[PDB]
């Protein structure tokens with residue numbers, strides 16, 4: 001899950 | 010917290026959050042070589058778009074899942090308005106990057122892309138004729154991300170819809186404040202707000218046509234598609 005991983009970082 | 014910012018703080022915020030300009034990899038282009046460059050560029054810019062979003066005042070207050078749905082439907086309108094904006098001072102050319110200045114005729118090198126270029130160029134001139142300002146530009150790009158998928162998100166969704174509409178209102182106050190500070194007459198301010206807001210319409214339309222073309226090119230195996238870019242491409246059909 002690209003998009004998600006970047007919203008959490 | 011975001012709802013408590015003044016017109017000047019919101020302007021500053023957004024001005025700081027702008028993403029950087031990226032370069033393109035280094036005689037005439039081929040259908041494949043040209044989509045390969047644009048796609049490699051759009052894929053690098055989305056990573057930056059994810060982190061510009063998070064700095065837009067109020068975006069992080071949304072549930073993660075609304076954050077995704079918003080980026081998922083607005084990514085190609087956000088890429089389009091940045092392009093129009095950096096092409097503003099180059100009549101007849103689209104500045105994909107500082108080392109990739111394409112014109113209408115290079116648009117013909119890829120099947121069915123010229124129509125798409127023709128509209129980006131017309132919006133670019135439209136913004137030149139109105140003399141769009143950098144402060145306005147940053148406000149428009151935020152309205153575009155907040156208005157992409159609010160009519161597509163039930164008790165927490167109505168709650169998230171209202172918060173979203175509250176940010177939109179503050180951005181509308183900001184834009185009105187920018188025009189007042191440059192001395193537009195009261196009448197003149199709502200004539201310019203509405204003209205800026207009708208260009209979003211055209212942007213939404215360039216976007217829908219842009220997805221179709223992209224997905225065509227992908228289904229013809231014309232270009233391999235990047236991990237993050239594929240993911241986002243799939244959010245529209247799916």
Ligand SMILES: C[C@]12CC[C@@H]3c4ccc(O)cc4CC[C@H]3[C@@H]1CC[C@@H]2O
Pocket residue numbers: 047048050051054088089091092105125218219220222223226
């Ligand atoms: C998605 C497309 C390739 C990537 C293009 C791009 C790539 C980078 C960028 O900053 C803006 C744009 C806008 C137009 C996009 C094109 C719309 C049609 C085409 O398939």
